[PDB]
Amino acid sequence: MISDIRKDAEVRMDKCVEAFKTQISKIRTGGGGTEERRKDLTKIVRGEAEQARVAVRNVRRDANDKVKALLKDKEISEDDDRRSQDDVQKLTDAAIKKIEAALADKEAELMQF
Amino acid sequence: AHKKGVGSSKNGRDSNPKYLGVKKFGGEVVKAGNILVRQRGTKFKAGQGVGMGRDHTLFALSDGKVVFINKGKGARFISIEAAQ
RNA sequence: CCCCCGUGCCCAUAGCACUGUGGAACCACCCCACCCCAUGCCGAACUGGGUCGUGAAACACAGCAGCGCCAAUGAUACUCGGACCGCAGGGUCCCGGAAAAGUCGGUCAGCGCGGGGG
RNA sequence: CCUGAGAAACUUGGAUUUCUAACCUGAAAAAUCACUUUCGGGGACCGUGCUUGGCGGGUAGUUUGACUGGGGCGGUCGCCUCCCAAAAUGUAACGGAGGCGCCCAAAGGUCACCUCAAGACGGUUGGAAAUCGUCUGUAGAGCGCAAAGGUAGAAGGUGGCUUGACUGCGAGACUGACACGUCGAGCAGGGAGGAAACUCGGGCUUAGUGAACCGGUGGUACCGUGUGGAAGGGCCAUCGAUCAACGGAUAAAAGUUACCCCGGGGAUAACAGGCUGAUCUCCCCCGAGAGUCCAUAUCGGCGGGGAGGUUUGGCACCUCGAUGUCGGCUCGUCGCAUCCUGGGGCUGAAGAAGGUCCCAAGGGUUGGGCUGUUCGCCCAUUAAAGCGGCACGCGAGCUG
RNA sequence: GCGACUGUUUACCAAAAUCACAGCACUCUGCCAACACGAACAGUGGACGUAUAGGGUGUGACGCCUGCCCGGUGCCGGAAGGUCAAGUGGAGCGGUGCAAGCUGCGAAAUGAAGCCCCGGUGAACGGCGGCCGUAACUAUAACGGUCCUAAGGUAGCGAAAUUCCUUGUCGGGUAAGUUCCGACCUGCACGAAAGGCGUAACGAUCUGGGCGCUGUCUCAACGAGGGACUCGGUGAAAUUGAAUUGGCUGUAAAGAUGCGGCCUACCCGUAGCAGGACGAAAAGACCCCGUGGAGCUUUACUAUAGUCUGGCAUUGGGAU
RNA sequence: GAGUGACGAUGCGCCGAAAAUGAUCGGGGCUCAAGUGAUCUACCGAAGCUAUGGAUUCAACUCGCGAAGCGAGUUGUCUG
RNA sequence: UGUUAUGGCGUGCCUAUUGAAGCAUGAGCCGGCGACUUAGACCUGACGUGCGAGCUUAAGUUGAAAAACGGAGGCGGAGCGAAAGCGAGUCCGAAUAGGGCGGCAUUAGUACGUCGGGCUAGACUCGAAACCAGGUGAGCUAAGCAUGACCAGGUUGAAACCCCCGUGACAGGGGGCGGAGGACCGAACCGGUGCCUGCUGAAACAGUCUCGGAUGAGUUGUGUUUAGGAGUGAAAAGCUAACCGAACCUGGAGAUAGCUAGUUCUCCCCGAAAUGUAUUGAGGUACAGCCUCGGAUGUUGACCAUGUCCUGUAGAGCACUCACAAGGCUAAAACCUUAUGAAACUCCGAAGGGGCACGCGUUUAGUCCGGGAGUGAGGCUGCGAGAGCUAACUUCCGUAGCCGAGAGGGAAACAACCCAGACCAUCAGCUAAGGUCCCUAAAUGAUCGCUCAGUGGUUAA
RNA sequence: GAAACGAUGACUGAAUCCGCGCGGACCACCGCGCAAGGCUAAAUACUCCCAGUGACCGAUAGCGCAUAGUACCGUGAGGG
RNA sequence: UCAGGGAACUGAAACAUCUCAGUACCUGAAGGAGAAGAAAGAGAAUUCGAUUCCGUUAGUAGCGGCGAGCGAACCCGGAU
């Protein structure tokens, strides 16, 4: 059954990450950096990362209840609870790992000029 | 109640005691009513002085000597040579 | 000496397939069929009563090594057992046993009883 | 006799209601009971005694299976098929695939009879399949359902009659540890189908199953506690269990314990060790390609060969009549895959500040905020502010 | 932050965010009360009380408050109807004997409370979701279909400790804050009498910051007194296979003083340190086992105290 | 300018090779090999086999006594 | 002899275990005490005696001195059936098929004894947690009740009370005054916060120093009542005479104890198992397997040969089945050429193996009846497979050897491996493994070369 | 359980000479015996106390004690 | 000894049934002994004859989640 939730989790997750990763490019007007006008712009970037974190947590606090309250109806025993956790972590941690990595490059451009 | 199943699919456990095989071989002095070879299909057909049971059980129709005969696969008859 | 008819053993080193020789005796077709008996429907089969003609066709004998089928010297696989190797995967040495396949070759039969004919 | 009235006999059942010397209950003189007494008040209800069904964890007594590469959740436990093998038999694993808890008023019995899959050429309300026909055809189809054996002289496809899908039996064998279980020639009684020899005691075989007890219902007239019956009992037959945790405690049984207790275990877990090393760490080989040019200055796809054992873990072997568990503080110390220094090579190295790889552990490697942290972020520095061992070094040292 | 407050407790590990409270609420009881102790129609406590009195439950200064859902459960109420106990009572089946007569089986109607069935009752148990979708300055809140059913959160609050997901995201104080205070809201799993939110005063309560001072610290140093040390006097313990009881590297049931090999080492103390003796101390208080045990719970099994109930009595007499 | 250059197969060996209390093939040492492939011989070396002595278990064969029984020789055992 | 120096070799006992010196259990040492019995006219058997048909029970008599009689009962003395019942036969059944028994190799035995064992009782010995009955006390702490006791000092400043303000007046504000308080500070007293000490204490719970309450729901004395599966409980399952989720004491039994530990004199013989099946079973036990003892038998065992039958691991291979390598070719399946894989493919297919009769070099077991057992997870190793990186001194089958219960030599050390299975004694000899420079014995022996790494002393692309 | 008889707690409530109880559901029959009134060593049971014997002990045995239910623990039961 | 009241481990390898048991403990009464004692009895070859006790009958007939396991009485010898 984990092979079913894994997809539904990765698809929806990567679908968002791939989306925001493209939206952040719409913020960059050109060069970025015109006398002090560099940090104030970063404020807009903070929103992209903030909304990203939540989006990655939603799927975790949504797909989990779909299985937790499912294995209680006499269908799936234990030993799968933690198994499902380590499954969403490899997706959540990986996502955040890409976000911070992406922002590291974006910030290097918005401050470059 | 649920919406999945009472048990996990894909099994592979739980076997069965088998058997069959040959009881009496060539050069055996059996008696009337002695099981020769057990089977389920038709590996060894009945010969002269031999009968066939329900589940194909070649038994001794009379006292004699168990002898096997083969013509090269296909069918193997088992005749019994009576003594005296 | 031959040949035909049945019925056996044998159960493809006897099978199929190219072609031929055969109908006098035997053999089949064919002819007819109210009813015995008979077809999911037809008497093609089964079957009753029976010529000539015929023997492409079913059969019967015969030749030809196309294909099937059988198929050994040597030799390798494996290997009981005996003695070892490499971290291991796995591998070898000695004494016997020792097949698949493929090579040569060999065939399309061989052995009876019975009844009918020259 | 048949209907209705009228009656001081009685008069069962029974609803109301009424009264009351029982009974209950209150003031007074010797206000616990008892005399009595005006009484009054309730009431023959209540309460009490026996009994019926109910509600009943308030209390009592118990149950809550097992396997289980620790327990638990889960899954799985009876039967037959293959496969798994040390090659007849047999044989383990929460080892690899699949079926049963039927079905058949007749695919059964007997006797007659019919040459299947599938392709091909040629025709039909057909242009995939079938159907009709003709060639081919070691049968490649079929056999109710699982697989296998069996695989055509048929069990395979049809028809008539039929219903042995029988009672009384079994020489002698298969199999089992026990109890079951399977197969069976021949006997008899009486029958069925062929003309006959004959076949026939369910179904091509293998699953379609359950001891024993307790009781239902037909047959039989063995007991029947003085004799004679009868009640009840016995034997034939057969029915009932989803006893499915299926060789099966009771007629009938779930949880929790961090309030926990006893008997035991390192034939079973967490710490640590150990074996291991998939995962981790790191070294090396190949050169896709980036790197202007160029594969190796640096970086090295795809794939590979080893190393160390500090990580997840697997196995769980000393240790559960006791190997104290994280971290810090204290004390340290050892290895190198060397963070800083020290010498070197190559650079895509001008200098300068670097990179990288090589050699090299003498010695050194700061102070704080947050954090319980190891770890990590940040502050301010520095030659630098290394990684890992040492029972994740150090509690008979401390903290807690 | 928690609770209002003073007050109480886990005599020998926890005094508190416990409990308790004043205050609010639901309910019960008018009788020899509910209720409770009792072998007892004995006695007594409730009360020499008597209903804004008495028991029960929960909740808990005071303030603004106290939403939607009774389907299921329990609670009161109803009531022609469906099932039932003992018993009354009528046809029947059978046994024995000659017969009178004598004995088993079982029976329509009728037979109490309860059960179903209807209503209500949530400051009674309690409930306030699952499947897919996201766009809208500033202002509160999230929609729309598909649903077992009875519903499916109105105010207020929202990382407090309730928010698993990182330190969630801006903000505040700091040189630097995985903390703490404001906010956002995505509340994995807030929330209304298992009460919400708030609140001055109090708390040996918990949390964070600042002021001041300081050997808590950077580093300690010194002084003192009580041991410790020395001699005279008295003289115990846990422990204890036995012992002339090294070091390394290797083995062995995989952590050796005792095995192997190598190396080190005169014999005996006294202070003293704690690495080892898997050092002591409790047959590990964690796990697994034993159809071992025990408390507790419950819509698990079953009696049963108790309490409801028809009949039978101590319980008769009159009128319809 | 009486010699060279390219591989293919094997016997031996070098690099690759980094561990934590001090190191080592058991150690010392060993190439004037005490390393290793093949060849032979001698010796060594178990409580195995052997020798001299003995005891025990089972059998049969000469015994003595009227008997249970004892002791005697023989083979094996004596399995540890 | 006592003692000793030097050499060699030399891992406590025990229990428990696959494996023990073990850093696993047990134990200071000695001493003595300390564990497989007793019983029933019990069952079943081995040895033995007495009869051979065998024998008494209770009791009755002698009653310094002893044994007898007692012949109720009990065991033999056919069986078969469910039973009626019939019988050197009886049930199944109206059949002559079988089961039970008789005859046949013919015991019928019985009673007493000793000894193995079984059953029932404490029933090898030691140990529970717990259960029940009765009883003990609130001189414990929990509380009620009756009656008394106590609270240095200081601070604060309530209502109420006189009076007063611009103002009819009613709510306020001020000064005086009063003394309220689950008020404040605080000693005693009460209770315990925080640190340190103490931790074989001074002490079975405390000291110093802090801290809390200190007219109060306060502290306290005396007397006194509730009880211990019940009381009490400003509620922790707290307390109820110092370990109370059910006191304590005595009895019910020395409860049960399938779990643990221990079980005492010697020698000789044999010699196990850790398998299979069933199990509310999985360390437990039943049946068999395996052991031994004895009675019958007395070569049937055992390996080795020979012929005879059955399998279809290994291999192979294509024309079957599932996948599969390149082209052809066709409107892709098929068919062709070349080429393949395969536990669950197979037309082929061995080794070895298995049943049988048969015998010799052989050989000396085999079996039947019956007594008493233990073991009932087993460990490693090569081989043959599953699991699992064909990873574990991993696990689960098969198989052989060892261990387990076998030492001795060898592999330095080392259950597993190699050589070998130890009756006793020998300052005696030949070997196996393995070695022969020195630490221990034995060629620092020969010949031909390989080496030069010090390889030989954990690895590969 | 077909399960009689006895035995009562609640209810009921015979006969009393051609009577009643019993005899294992019940009936017939045959058979056996008379309750609801009472008393009775003995042969039985035990062992504080005595006397005798003992393949019983002999002072960590035998009762707990060769002289104590004392010393001592306990509030106490009790233990000893 | 009699009477009134009357367990639970434990057994069934659980367990409510039964078992342990009408044992233990408590209580009431009495004595040297008691309980019981002269048959509406057992029971049956139409037998015997107050009560108790011993042996046997019989670990039979029978009871039983008919599992565990419990388990008479008449007749027959005898104390009397």
Tab-separated table of C-alpha atoms (C1' of nucleotides) in Angstrom, chain G residues 32-278:
chain	number	residue	atom	x	y	z
G	32	G	C1'	28.190	-31.933	62.828
G	33	C	C1'	22.776	-31.837	61.001
G	34	G	C1'	20.912	-32.116	55.985
G	35	A	C1'	17.072	-35.058	50.387
G	36	C	C1'	14.219	-40.676	46.162
G	37	U	C1'	10.789	-43.226	52.056
G	38	U	C1'	6.156	-44.900	54.436
G	39	A	C1'	1.668	-47.065	53.687
G	40	G	C1'	-2.444	-50.216	51.254
G	41	A	C1'	-5.349	-58.182	52.483
G	42	C	C1'	-3.183	-52.218	45.694
G	43	C	C1'	-1.828	-53.382	40.480
G	44	U	C1'	2.125	-55.424	37.136
G	45	G	C1'	6.607	-58.009	36.680
G	46	A	C1'	12.168	-60.226	38.087
G	47	C	C1'	14.503	-63.628	41.589
G	48	G	C1'	13.099	-67.241	45.672
G	49	U	C1'	10.711	-70.856	48.703
G	50	G	C1'	6.076	-73.667	49.868
G	51	C	C1'	2.398	-76.475	47.818
G	52	G	C1'	1.254	-77.796	42.975
G	53	A	C1'	-4.722	-76.468	43.022
G	54	G	C1'	-2.624	-72.745	45.818
G	55	C	C1'	-4.210	-68.923	50.422
G	56	U	C1'	-6.718	-66.880	54.463
G	57	U	C1'	-9.762	-61.820	56.758
G	58	A	C1'	-11.529	-60.066	60.883
G	59	A	C1'	-11.566	-62.934	64.972
G	60	G	C1'	-11.059	-66.925	68.803
G	61	U	C1'	-7.084	-69.376	72.498
G	62	U	C1'	-1.910	-69.649	74.944
G	63	G	C1'	-0.997	-64.351	77.045
G	64	A	C1'	7.337	-64.962	81.379
G	65	A	C1'	8.203	-67.849	77.689
G	66	A	C1'	5.671	-69.580	71.320
G	67	A	C1'	2.035	-70.418	67.564
G	68	A	C1'	-1.508	-72.083	66.312
G	69	C	C1'	-7.388	-73.002	64.926
G	70	G	C1'	-10.172	-69.804	62.424
G	71	G	C1'	-11.367	-72.326	55.693
G	72	A	C1'	-16.891	-65.591	55.248
G	73	G	C1'	-13.629	-64.052	51.249
G	74	G	C1'	-10.032	-64.028	47.750
G	75	C	C1'	-6.720	-66.269	42.860
G	76	G	C1'	-6.911	-70.828	39.383
G	77	G	C1'	-10.731	-73.574	37.145
G	78	A	C1'	-12.770	-72.080	28.832
G	79	G	C1'	-15.085	-68.188	25.877
G	80	C	C1'	-17.630	-65.086	22.818
G	81	G	C1'	-21.412	-61.228	22.614
G	82	A	C1'	-23.828	-54.823	23.733
G	83	A	C1'	-27.112	-58.045	25.745
G	84	A	C1'	-30.745	-61.772	26.193
G	85	G	C1'	-27.611	-66.292	26.230
G	86	C	C1'	-25.297	-70.133	24.067
G	87	G	C1'	-21.093	-72.836	24.482
G	88	A	C1'	-14.534	-77.493	23.943
G	89	G	C1'	-17.675	-72.698	20.955
G	90	U	C1'	-19.919	-67.564	20.617
G	91	C	C1'	-20.986	-62.917	18.013
G	92	C	C1'	-21.609	-60.122	12.622
G	93	G	C1'	-25.707	-62.296	9.066
G	94	A	C1'	-30.896	-66.449	7.796
G	95	A	C1'	-25.774	-67.799	6.132
G	96	U	C1'	-20.989	-71.299	5.182
G	97	A	C1'	-16.217	-64.478	4.264
G	98	G	C1'	-13.973	-62.598	9.440
G	99	G	C1'	-13.126	-61.061	14.506
G	100	G	C1'	-12.873	-63.045	19.309
G	101	C	C1'	-11.344	-68.069	21.788
G	102	G	C1'	-10.282	-73.684	21.900
G	103	G	C1'	-7.093	-77.582	20.004
G	104	C	C1'	-1.253	-77.238	18.122
G	105	A	C1'	4.887	-75.964	19.735
G	106	U	C1'	0.108	-78.449	26.127
G	107	U	C1'	2.240	-73.764	32.728
G	108	A	C1'	-3.417	-73.658	35.346
G	109	G	C1'	-0.923	-72.102	38.722
G	110	U	C1'	-1.236	-69.853	44.177
G	111	A	C1'	0.315	-68.015	48.506
G	112	C	C1'	4.758	-65.543	51.565
G	113	G	C1'	9.233	-63.069	50.604
G	114	U	C1'	13.008	-59.605	48.313
G	115	C	C1'	13.950	-56.574	44.541
G	116	G	C1'	12.603	-52.817	39.379
G	117	G	C1'	8.157	-50.139	38.435
G	118	G	C1'	2.714	-48.013	38.526
G	119	C	C1'	-1.312	-45.930	41.051
G	120	U	C1'	-3.290	-43.026	45.788
G	121	A	C1'	-1.559	-40.242	49.683
G	122	G	C1'	3.414	-34.920	52.209
G	123	A	C1'	5.155	-39.295	48.401
G	124	C	C1'	13.213	-36.998	46.406
G	125	U	C1'	14.351	-32.502	49.561
G	126	C	C1'	14.150	-26.883	49.681
G	127	G	C1'	11.491	-22.037	47.834
G	128	A	C1'	6.591	-18.731	46.394
G	129	A	C1'	3.467	-14.204	44.855
G	130	A	C1'	-0.837	-15.430	46.462
G	131	C	C1'	-6.229	-18.030	48.933
G	132	C	C1'	-9.486	-19.097	52.944
G	133	A	C1'	-11.007	-19.235	58.479
G	134	G	C1'	-10.649	-17.559	63.003
G	135	G	C1'	-8.494	-14.219	66.056
G	136	U	C1'	-5.100	-9.557	67.427
G	137	G	C1'	-4.963	-3.977	68.276
G	138	A	C1'	-6.202	2.863	66.433
G	139	G	C1'	-0.606	2.737	73.501
G	140	C	C1'	0.548	3.465	64.528
G	141	U	C1'	-0.748	7.194	61.705
G	142	A	C1'	-6.473	8.509	59.613
G	143	A	C1'	-10.601	10.908	61.640
G	144	G	C1'	-15.350	11.816	64.987
G	145	C	C1'	-16.644	12.897	69.700
G	146	A	C1'	-16.384	14.903	75.417
G	147	U	C1'	-13.578	17.779	78.063
G	148	G	C1'	-9.236	21.036	78.890
G	149	A	C1'	-4.790	23.384	77.151
G	150	C	C1'	-1.864	27.086	74.518
G	151	C	C1'	-0.797	31.481	70.770
G	152	A	C1'	6.472	36.959	73.089
G	153	G	C1'	6.233	41.149	71.033
G	154	G	C1'	5.322	44.767	66.922
G	155	U	C1'	2.276	46.583	62.261
G	156	U	C1'	-2.065	47.757	59.878
G	157	G	C1'	-6.356	50.144	60.467
G	158	A	C1'	-13.207	47.710	59.024
G	159	A	C1'	-17.847	48.507	59.805
G	160	A	C1'	-20.354	50.992	63.222
G	161	C	C1'	-20.079	56.196	66.050
G	162	C	C1'	-19.662	62.614	66.914
G	163	C	C1'	-18.893	66.381	63.743
G	164	C	C1'	-18.056	69.035	59.448
G	165	C	C1'	-18.769	70.946	53.184
G	166	G	C1'	-21.645	75.209	48.135
G	167	U	C1'	-25.952	73.134	48.718
G	168	G	C1'	-33.652	71.317	50.647
G	169	A	C1'	-32.426	66.979	50.690
G	170	C	C1'	-30.472	61.545	49.188
G	171	A	C1'	-25.097	58.982	47.048
G	172	G	C1'	-19.217	61.312	48.780
G	173	G	C1'	-15.200	63.356	50.878
G	174	G	C1'	-12.425	64.865	55.742
G	175	G	C1'	-10.950	64.994	60.863
G	176	G	C1'	-11.879	62.620	65.317
G	177	C	C1'	-13.090	57.613	67.112
G	178	G	C1'	-13.493	52.747	67.085
G	179	G	C1'	-11.099	48.273	66.884
G	180	A	C1'	-12.404	44.277	62.221
G	181	G	C1'	-9.506	40.790	60.109
G	182	G	C1'	-9.520	32.210	56.699
G	183	A	C1'	-4.797	40.756	57.621
G	184	C	C1'	0.674	41.820	57.991
G	185	C	C1'	6.021	41.258	60.432
G	186	G	C1'	7.620	37.570	64.041
G	187	A	C1'	9.572	33.822	68.670
G	188	A	C1'	7.882	29.903	70.857
G	189	C	C1'	4.623	26.109	68.519
G	190	C	C1'	2.978	23.621	63.900
G	191	G	C1'	4.863	21.897	58.798
G	192	G	C1'	8.106	20.941	55.794
G	193	U	C1'	10.541	24.471	50.609
G	194	G	C1'	16.111	24.710	48.956
G	195	C	C1'	21.367	23.403	49.389
G	196	C	C1'	24.925	20.932	51.933
G	197	U	C1'	25.965	17.024	55.341
G	198	G	C1'	24.753	12.485	56.605
G	199	C	C1'	24.577	7.945	53.143
G	200	U	C1'	27.982	-0.119	57.405
G	201	G	C1'	24.274	7.772	60.029
G	202	A	C1'	23.803	10.612	65.995
G	203	A	C1'	19.284	8.851	63.737
G	204	A	C1'	15.758	2.620	59.896
G	205	C	C1'	14.844	9.830	57.995
G	206	A	C1'	17.749	13.377	60.761
G	207	G	C1'	21.358	18.399	61.525
G	208	U	C1'	22.925	23.276	60.411
G	209	C	C1'	21.331	27.050	57.433
G	210	U	C1'	17.155	28.764	54.749
G	211	C	C1'	11.553	28.674	53.918
G	212	G	C1'	6.018	28.291	55.096
G	213	G	C1'	1.693	29.011	58.814
G	214	A	C1'	1.909	31.694	63.362
G	215	U	C1'	-6.934	34.277	66.184
G	216	G	C1'	-6.605	30.257	62.472
G	217	A	C1'	-10.275	25.162	57.932
G	218	G	C1'	-4.541	26.835	64.270
G	219	U	C1'	-1.493	24.083	67.160
G	220	U	C1'	-2.483	20.548	71.615
G	221	G	C1'	-3.253	17.291	76.125
G	222	U	C1'	-6.611	13.581	78.167
G	223	G	C1'	-10.420	10.435	77.843
G	224	U	C1'	-12.814	7.931	73.684
G	225	U	C1'	-15.383	5.480	69.072
G	226	U	C1'	-14.793	3.488	63.639
G	227	A	C1'	-10.695	-1.802	61.726
G	228	G	C1'	-7.321	-3.608	58.878
G	229	G	C1'	-10.525	-6.644	51.283
G	230	A	C1'	-12.815	-3.405	56.058
G	231	G	C1'	-12.040	1.739	58.579
G	232	U	C1'	-10.261	6.231	57.703
G	233	G	C1'	-9.171	9.339	53.751
G	234	A	C1'	-9.254	18.886	52.400
G	235	A	C1'	-8.204	11.882	48.138
G	236	A	C1'	-1.940	10.197	47.029
G	237	A	C1'	-4.744	3.784	46.458
G	238	G	C1'	-2.376	7.756	51.237
G	239	C	C1'	-3.086	5.516	56.232
G	240	U	C1'	-4.519	1.758	59.481
G	241	A	C1'	2.122	-0.044	65.352
G	242	A	C1'	8.951	1.851	60.477
G	243	C	C1'	8.657	-2.371	52.662
G	244	C	C1'	-0.164	-2.378	53.166
G	245	G	C1'	-3.270	-1.831	45.043
G	246	A	C1'	-5.478	-5.165	50.354
G	247	A	C1'	-2.301	-5.335	58.158
G	248	C	C1'	-0.896	-8.523	61.604
G	249	C	C1'	-1.036	-13.408	64.292
G	250	U	C1'	-2.534	-18.898	64.103
G	251	G	C1'	-4.493	-22.796	61.642
G	252	G	C1'	-6.112	-24.842	56.391
G	253	A	C1'	-0.953	-28.662	53.704
G	254	G	C1'	5.290	-29.363	54.349
G	255	A	C1'	-1.434	-25.132	49.313
G	256	U	C1'	0.516	-25.483	44.161
G	257	A	C1'	5.143	-24.916	42.299
G	258	G	C1'	4.937	-28.231	34.822
G	259	C	C1'	10.205	-23.201	37.253
G	260	U	C1'	15.267	-23.051	40.108
G	261	A	C1'	18.851	-25.286	43.105
G	262	G	C1'	20.670	-29.740	45.636
G	263	U	C1'	20.445	-35.214	46.012
G	264	U	C1'	25.074	-38.335	49.985
G	265	C	C1'	29.725	-45.461	49.225
G	266	U	C1'	33.070	-48.171	45.288
G	267	C	C1'	33.946	-51.207	41.005
G	268	C	C1'	32.535	-53.892	36.563
G	269	C	C1'	29.033	-54.087	31.613
G	270	C	C1'	26.113	-51.816	28.083
G	271	G	C1'	25.297	-47.433	26.216
G	272	A	C1'	21.227	-43.185	24.287
G	273	A	C1'	18.549	-38.613	22.216
G	274	A	C1'	18.134	-33.469	20.952
G	275	U	C1'	14.226	-37.140	15.522
G	276	G	C1'	8.713	-37.982	13.795
G	277	U	C1'	3.472	-37.164	15.025
G	278	A	C1'	-0.283	-34.821	18.355
